[PDB]
């Protein structure tokens with residue numbers, strides 16, 4: 001296992017604050033809140049089965065999806081829309097991309113360690129998540 005996804009990473013923040021907002025138009029306060037909100041997260045995979053959750057005040061969210069075994073998730077709590085996903089390891093990565101009105105809500109959570117450059121495409125005008133910690 002040359003990846004060790006299973007990590008912690010007190011989220012720093014996203015770059016295109018506004019483009020990720022659009023990925024699921026919560027509200028205008030949403031993006032400004034998350035902009036500065038340095039939340040916590042921590043994934044953990046065992047092979048073909050992983051899970052992670054965010055730790056914010058504003059909103060609580062989670063992905064909890066397998067690795068390539070397509071699944072119709074939901075964004076309940078946040079916006080309340082229906083979605084689907086798909087994940088495939090891509091080096092030290094695990095290319096996820098949402099569906100169900102999304103079609104461009106994917107990430108490039110490739111792990112470096114102490115630093116991390118999750119790239120939140122999330123619709124046109126790609127955003128760059130900015131992680132750092134574990």
Ligand SMILES: CC1=C(/C=C/C(C)=C/C=C/C(C)=C/CO)C(C)(C)CCC1
Nearest residue numbers: 034043052054056058059060061063109
């Ligand atoms: C906008 C927004 C949030 C961001 C959620 C995300 C984007 C969590 C990331 C999950 C992923 C991509 C895990 C893959 O390892 C949360 C709910 C947390 C706080 C307020 C609103």
